[PDB]
Design a protein around this nucleic acid. Structure first.
Ligand code: MG
Ligand code: MG
Ligand code: MG
Ligand code: MG
Ligand code: MG
Ligand code: MG
Ligand code: MG
Ligand code: MG
Ligand code: MG
Ligand code: MG
Ligand code: MG
Ligand code: MG
Ligand code: MG
Ligand code: MG
Ligand code: MG
Length: 70
RNA sequence: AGAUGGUAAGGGCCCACGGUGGAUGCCUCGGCACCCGAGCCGAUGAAGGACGUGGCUACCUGCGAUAAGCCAGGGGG
């Protein structure tokens, strides 16, 4: 992902509630599966998207853990 | 009547050139010694492991379902 898009992702994430972060992670893990399915049938030439979503999910869960940690 | 040479199936010695083999010399990522520095880790689960982890990934390295990585500060360019 572009550095600017990563910065923005964290800014918006840090404004979300724990509940919204959970819902969002759930949806991104759903999209990851969809990406897996495509990569499995050789229909995902943009394979960089898989790593990207995975790190997004990690960033999201990192912030979720941030919110809950205090 | 007599006398003495050319035979090389193959062999021997020498010479040339190869093959095999990996000595020798050069080399060094590694090692050895001494000296100095530094010196504990663990139930907040250690030491050490198993299994995982990559779009394609056998192994090694890293990492742990957030899985060759997540956040932030510092360095750097
Ligand atoms: Mg990043
Ligand atoms: Mg004769
Ligand atoms: Mg002869
Ligand atoms: Mg002959
Ligand atoms: Mg002889
Ligand atoms: Mg020879
Ligand atoms: Mg020889
Ligand atoms: Mg050789
Ligand atoms: Mg020498
Ligand atoms: Mg020590
Ligand atoms: Mg261990
Ligand atoms: Mg491994
Ligand atoms: Mg960082
Ligand atoms: Mg940094
Ligand atoms: Mg920096």
């Amino acid at each position: 992902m572009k550095l600017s898009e990563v910065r923005k992702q964290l800014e918006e994430a840090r404004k979300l509630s724990p509940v919204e972060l959970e819902k969002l992670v759930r949806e991104k893990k759903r999209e990851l599966m969809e990406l897996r399915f495509q990569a499995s049938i050789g229909q995902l030439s943009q394979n960089h998207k898989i790593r990207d979503l995975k790190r997004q999910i990690a960033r999201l869960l990192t912030v979720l853990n941030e919110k809950r940690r205090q």
